[PDB]
Amino acid sequence: NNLVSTMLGDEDFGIMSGDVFKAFGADGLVKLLAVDSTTMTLPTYDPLILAQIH
Amino acid sequence: RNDVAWYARYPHILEEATRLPFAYPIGQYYDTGYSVASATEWSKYVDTSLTIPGVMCVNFTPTPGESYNKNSPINIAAQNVYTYVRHMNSGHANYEQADLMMYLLAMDSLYIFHSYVRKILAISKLYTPVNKYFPRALLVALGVDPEDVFANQAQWEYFVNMVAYRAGAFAAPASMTYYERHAWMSNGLYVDQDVTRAQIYMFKPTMLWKYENLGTTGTKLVPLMMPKAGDNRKLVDFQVLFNNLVSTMLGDEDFGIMSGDVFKAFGADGLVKLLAVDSTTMTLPTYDPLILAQIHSARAVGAPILETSTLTGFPGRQWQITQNPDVNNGAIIFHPSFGYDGQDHEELSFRAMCSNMILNLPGEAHSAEMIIEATRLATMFQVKAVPAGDTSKPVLYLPNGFGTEVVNDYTMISVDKATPHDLTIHTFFNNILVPNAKENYVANLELLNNIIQFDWAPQLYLTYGIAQESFGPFAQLNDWTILTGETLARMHEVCVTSMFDVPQMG
Amino acid sequence: ESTRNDVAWYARYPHILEEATRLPFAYPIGQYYDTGYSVASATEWSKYVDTSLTIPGVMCVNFTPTPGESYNKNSPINIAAQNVYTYVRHMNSGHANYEQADLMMYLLAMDSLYIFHSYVRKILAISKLYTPVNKYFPRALLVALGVDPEDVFANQAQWEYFVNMVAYRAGAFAAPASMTYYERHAWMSNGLYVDQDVTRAQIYMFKPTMLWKYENLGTTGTKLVPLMMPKAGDNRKLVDFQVLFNNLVSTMLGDEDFGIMSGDVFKAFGADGLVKLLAVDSTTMTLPTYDPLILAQIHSARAVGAPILETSTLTGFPGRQWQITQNPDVNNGAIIFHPSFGYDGQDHEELSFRAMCSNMILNLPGEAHSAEMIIEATRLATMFQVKAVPAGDTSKPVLYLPNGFGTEVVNDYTMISVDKATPHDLTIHTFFNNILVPNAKENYVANLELLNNIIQFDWAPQLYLTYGIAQESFGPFAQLNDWTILTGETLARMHEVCVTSMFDVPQMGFNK
Amino acid sequence: TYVRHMNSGHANYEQADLMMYLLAMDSLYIFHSYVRKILAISKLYTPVNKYFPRALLVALGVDPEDVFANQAQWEYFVNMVAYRAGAFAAPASMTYYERHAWMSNGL
Amino acid sequence: NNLVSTMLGDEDFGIMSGDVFKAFGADGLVKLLAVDSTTMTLPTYDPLILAQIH
Amino acid sequence: RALLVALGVDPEDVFANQAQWEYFVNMVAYRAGAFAAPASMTYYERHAWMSNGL
Amino acid sequence: RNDVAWYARYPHILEEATRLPFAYPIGQ
């Protein structure tokens, strides 16, 4: 609530959000992931992550 | 041995001894008579009366759902609908997001008024010999003089058709299920059971929202009180209420600009459609188990506070949806105080609503849609409103959240057991005070027996004057649960979000 | 679903709907539940906020087995006595040392033995019922029948073998199996009945208030006097029920006329035509069933009050004790059972019995009603007809004479619930259909609590509530569906039909 | 997680209240197995083994004449223990209960 | 009796019993089977029991 | 539990209040997902790659 | 015009209002 206090129900942020929606189409926006009791992530092996952690 | 039964050896004896008249018409007083003929010496100790009620009207008020700041669900909804309308109406628009949302709320109050007068018109056709409450008790519960509707049928039909023609000239999105929900509640007759001598549930708006654009300090939706049951209001009063409702919208330039913008954004197949009415138009009482489940868990919040309300110690607590641009960063604001009963005193029955509610359902398996529809008319108090002053006669409460409508009252219409056996109007909350007088205990018992005739009737919380003690939920429970304010607030915050929802542009 | 289509936000956001509406719905009944406060500062209003929630579990209907208002020779029990004496004595070559009413009072004394066996085998079968979803089982049912629930636990083998030995000693007497009188009283008093066929359902029972104890006179005749059964708070052990059975069959096993009549009924009806009380074992459990006829007659049940004993003191009514008598010198040698109703157990007027002096309402489920449904729904209904005339100048109680009653009458009802105050133990409330509420502040919320406990039961008896502050009664406190006003002659005709049907024997040659 | 969250359970207890309830149920099951072993032992008589059943009954801590003279009361007490244990619920697929029953019921 | 004393009157045990009952069903619960007059245990040979006794 | 301690959350709160946590994260996705952002920017995709992977 | 009778439009009302017990036993 401290993060989105100045954005939820705000007119200027809604104007900018609608403009990004019209410029980049709905298939070209970011998609947040839903979560249920089925949702779990498994530890994967990524050598690109390890090289920049190093 | 023969081993044939006695009832099979003489079936005529059994069929003659058990021929009884059933299906007594309701709407009619019945005297049972005496089994001990000498018992007329006991005057009131022998109750020979039998009155069946027919109408319980749920008196409601449409709300946006407890706006405190700009992060409210109605302000997020205003943002989304203004982004949709603005990026479909390429050009120069002067209104804000909140002017558009307040236009949408005033449109909702218009649609509720149109379905209200259309229900007044469509009830008056209803006749059946086995229910004598049709149609006069349903018209008394809606606050109209029933003889005025019969004597002036063409003027009434013209008035409701012109309400549909005028109020139907402003566009509103039918993708919002808010309007569809109020149309579902506000022009339907609902039986408590799927029988012919069933009892009728109705929804009548207690108040509606009048637009009231003022000065430069935004807009401010103010209450417009509807006729209460027992008022014999005529067509001229409903015409005055209509003209008071659309005084600031008919032939207005800004409302026409917003209406044309909603028309261009949401197409003509995606707007709401008001229903026409003729002499052929009539509504029949249907069986809807979704209506009964939320009538069951309904909790009445009290009377709306107006400017002319004289709350001692509570100034400025009148119910109003405000849009001041210098206050709360120009956010739509609505947070009413509850527990007002029309008078300037304490109303100690509202203390009985300070416990956790019971959510009761039929069956043993409950769907999530079923659970969330059964909680739509429920409203639990959370804290007490702070008295500003030295003394305070009333006690007000603040909820944790409420849905798209709150219940104000219920009105039960039954027949009088004394001659000439005319209708009786009883208005009550979920809470009921019984003060210490002899004329209150048997009357309260009559009212409780009248309420338990209604199948999924709201749960009662009685209190007694000399006992200083409230009794809990007077209702038959089947498969219940105890709700807290946070769970119901989560459900309210979900349902206010779902009702004001529009799609995207792609 | 009239005009509501959907919201369609719940379909594309079903997970938010799922974790927004995740509630527990299956509370085990049998214990107290505190709701809590919505407004947390409402503890300053002590009793003005009700946070208590008590569901009741058991309503026991306390009944008396009756022959059905015999006051002359044209009674149904006297016509049945003439039929059974014609079949046993004349159609089969029977003995000639007894009369037509001796047989019928023997056959009425056998029904008390059968009701006693059904009662103790219900006590035995209840004590093995334990459920997580119902914490009333089995202690509330055992308390409502009047036993110590720990005595049936700690002496289960002695209880079971006592039930079996009662069924074995009942074989020394003979009674015909095709009398549906015995079958009806057994089917009523053996059985737990749910009110709406759910998991956490409410339970209806039938317990005898009293039984008929056979008293042998000289040449004066033959009587059947009440033997009182234990009430719902008595905590009676096995020794009390053994004493009750031993003075129930005391004057029966040593009587020579009962031996002659037992051998006569045995050789008239055969061995396979007799009533057999079947033996139970360690795996015999009763279960709660759903019977809409039982609920139909519980709903239209009218209590008649306490039985009048010979030790009962009633000013102005000296000789009104309940008894099935027979004197060959009095009333042409007819069986006479003509009881006064409206007794509450005290020497004063139960002021609420005035509210039972209006015509009853026969309420039924559905919209179509069979003849058998109407004849079964009126079985426990008993309307008053006239005041009994008091002897002398003054009289404290007010007694009532009916216009016919069925093959059993209801004396009262007993409801078992949990207490709303700590330690939330079981509470026993005994009440008639009429309930008096005296002018005192402690009785109003008590009566309202009793009303809310009663409306939990589905086909509950209709109540009549007299308020002493108002000098006024309110009528039938019930939800009505498809009802009719019933007068005394209609109920009398239905009672005559059922008592004639209950005492009929189809084993006989009567209308082959 | 399974009782409270996967099935819609009540929220007035915690994760350790459930497990201590389920641990208290095992003592009831061990007690029923113990008294039914006491009951089943007392009917074992063999010519080739004169320890039966008095040594087994002494080793369990009972009076071997009390189980003889009160056999019906002992059996119906075992059955009533199994009947009153049905007032509480515990899952059958925990092999904890099955192991303790299989150990304490058996010679 | 003092094993089940604090168990049958406890309200939390009643709630937890109903919860385990509705979660695991009725056939998923532990049933202590009833004995009768002809139920005799017999000595058996189990080499796992001897393996853990040793 | 170690992965929850490293993220700064009381682990028992996530187990005891699983439905409230699921509702909170789904409403964060519903609210924050109402503002558009370009998925052609691989900045968001990189932070999503780093920030919800084990 | 419809010209159907009231008793043919609501026969259930007529059959419910006239269900009376007859054939009372004599001797009583």
PDB file of N, CA, C and O in Angstrom, chain C residues 476-495:
ATOM      1  N   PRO C 476     -51.044 -20.549  16.954  1.00  0.00           N
ATOM      2  CA  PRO C 476     -50.032 -21.530  16.540  1.00  0.00           C
ATOM      3  C   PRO C 476     -48.741 -20.891  16.052  1.00  0.00           C
ATOM      4  O   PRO C 476     -48.706 -20.256  14.996  1.00  0.00           O
ATOM      5  N   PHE C 477     -47.679 -21.050  16.837  1.00  0.00           N
ATOM      6  CA  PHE C 477     -46.351 -20.563  16.479  1.00  0.00           C
ATOM      7  C   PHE C 477     -45.679 -21.649  15.653  1.00  0.00           C
ATOM      8  O   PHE C 477     -45.011 -22.537  16.181  1.00  0.00           O
ATOM      9  N   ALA C 478     -45.866 -21.573  14.338  1.00  0.00           N
ATOM     10  CA  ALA C 478     -45.277 -22.504  13.387  1.00  0.00           C
ATOM     11  C   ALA C 478     -45.326 -21.871  12.009  1.00  0.00           C
ATOM     12  O   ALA C 478     -46.095 -20.939  11.765  1.00  0.00           O
ATOM     13  N   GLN C 479     -44.500 -22.392  11.112  1.00  0.00           N
ATOM     14  CA  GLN C 479     -44.574 -22.036   9.704  1.00  0.00           C
ATOM     15  C   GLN C 479     -45.528 -23.000   9.015  1.00  0.00           C
ATOM     16  O   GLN C 479     -45.311 -24.215   9.035  1.00  0.00           O
ATOM     17  N   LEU C 480     -46.582 -22.460   8.417  1.00  0.00           N
ATOM     18  CA  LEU C 480     -47.624 -23.258   7.792  1.00  0.00           C
ATOM     19  C   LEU C 480     -47.364 -23.377   6.299  1.00  0.00           C
ATOM     20  O   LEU C 480     -46.860 -22.444   5.673  1.00  0.00           O
ATOM     21  N   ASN C 481     -47.686 -24.541   5.734  1.00  0.00           N
ATOM     22  CA  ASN C 481     -47.511 -24.754   4.303  1.00  0.00           C
ATOM     23  C   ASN C 481     -48.832 -24.973   3.585  1.00  0.00           C
ATOM     24  O   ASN C 481     -49.233 -24.140   2.767  1.00  0.00           O
ATOM     25  N   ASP C 482     -49.549 -26.041   3.910  1.00  0.00           N
ATOM     26  CA  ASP C 482     -50.827 -26.362   3.282  1.00  0.00           C
ATOM     27  C   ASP C 482     -51.675 -26.936   4.403  1.00  0.00           C
ATOM     28  O   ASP C 482     -51.526 -28.101   4.776  1.00  0.00           O
ATOM     29  N   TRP C 483     -52.550 -26.109   4.940  1.00  0.00           N
ATOM     30  CA  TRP C 483     -53.167 -26.362   6.218  1.00  0.00           C
ATOM     31  C   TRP C 483     -54.680 -26.367   6.082  1.00  0.00           C
ATOM     32  O   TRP C 483     -55.242 -25.988   5.054  1.00  0.00           O
ATOM     33  N   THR C 484     -55.332 -26.810   7.150  1.00  0.00           N
ATOM     34  CA  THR C 484     -56.780 -26.813   7.232  1.00  0.00           C
ATOM     35  C   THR C 484     -57.173 -26.669   8.693  1.00  0.00           C
ATOM     36  O   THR C 484     -56.456 -27.126   9.585  1.00  0.00           O
ATOM     37  N   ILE C 485     -58.279 -25.978   8.936  1.00  0.00           N
ATOM     38  CA  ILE C 485     -58.829 -25.908  10.283  1.00  0.00           C
ATOM     39  C   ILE C 485     -59.615 -27.184  10.533  1.00  0.00           C
ATOM     40  O   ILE C 485     -60.478 -27.562   9.735  1.00  0.00           O
ATOM     41  N   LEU C 486     -59.306 -27.857  11.631  1.00  0.00           N
ATOM     42  CA  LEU C 486     -59.879 -29.149  11.965  1.00  0.00           C
ATOM     43  C   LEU C 486     -60.742 -28.999  13.207  1.00  0.00           C
ATOM     44  O   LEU C 486     -60.284 -28.464  14.220  1.00  0.00           O
ATOM     45  N   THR C 487     -61.989 -29.451  13.125  1.00  0.00           N
ATOM     46  CA  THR C 487     -62.890 -29.413  14.263  1.00  0.00           C
ATOM     47  C   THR C 487     -62.846 -30.747  15.001  1.00  0.00           C
ATOM     48  O   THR C 487     -62.141 -31.680  14.614  1.00  0.00           O
ATOM     49  N   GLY C 488     -63.624 -30.833  16.081  1.00  0.00           N
ATOM     50  CA  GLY C 488     -63.535 -31.988  16.957  1.00  0.00           C
ATOM     51  C   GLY C 488     -64.146 -33.246  16.370  1.00  0.00           C
ATOM     52  O   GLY C 488     -63.673 -34.352  16.635  1.00  0.00           O
ATOM     53  N   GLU C 489     -65.200 -33.101  15.564  1.00  0.00           N
ATOM     54  CA  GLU C 489     -65.871 -34.278  15.022  1.00  0.00           C
ATOM     55  C   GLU C 489     -65.067 -34.914  13.896  1.00  0.00           C
ATOM     56  O   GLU C 489     -65.088 -36.139  13.730  1.00  0.00           O
ATOM     57  N   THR C 490     -64.345 -34.103  13.123  1.00  0.00           N
ATOM     58  CA  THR C 490     -63.487 -34.632  12.067  1.00  0.00           C
ATOM     59  C   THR C 490     -62.322 -35.416  12.654  1.00  0.00           C
ATOM     60  O   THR C 490     -62.009 -36.529  12.204  1.00  0.00           O
ATOM     61  N   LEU C 491     -61.686 -34.851  13.683  1.00  0.00           N
ATOM     62  CA  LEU C 491     -60.609 -35.539  14.378  1.00  0.00           C
ATOM     63  C   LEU C 491     -61.122 -36.776  15.106  1.00  0.00           C
ATOM     64  O   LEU C 491     -60.422 -37.790  15.179  1.00  0.00           O
ATOM     65  N   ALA C 492     -62.353 -36.721  15.619  1.00  0.00           N
ATOM     66  CA  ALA C 492     -62.960 -37.879  16.270  1.00  0.00           C
ATOM     67  C   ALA C 492     -63.213 -39.007  15.282  1.00  0.00           C
ATOM     68  O   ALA C 492     -62.997 -40.181  15.601  1.00  0.00           O
ATOM     69  N   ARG C 493     -63.672 -38.663  14.078  1.00  0.00           N
ATOM     70  CA  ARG C 493     -63.895 -39.656  13.034  1.00  0.00           C
ATOM     71  C   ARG C 493     -62.586 -40.298  12.596  1.00  0.00           C
ATOM     72  O   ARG C 493     -62.514 -41.521  12.409  1.00  0.00           O
ATOM     73  N   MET C 494     -61.530 -39.489  12.468  1.00  0.00           N
ATOM     74  CA  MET C 494     -60.218 -40.020  12.110  1.00  0.00           C
ATOM     75  C   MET C 494     -59.648 -40.912  13.210  1.00  0.00           C
ATOM     76  O   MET C 494     -59.039 -41.955  12.926  1.00  0.00           O
ATOM     77  N   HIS C 495     -59.857 -40.529  14.474  1.00  0.00           N
ATOM     78  CA  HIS C 495     -59.412 -41.344  15.600  1.00  0.00           C
ATOM     79  C   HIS C 495     -60.156 -42.668  15.659  1.00  0.00           C
ATOM     80  O   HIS C 495     -59.559 -43.703  15.963  1.00  0.00           O
TER      81      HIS C 495
END
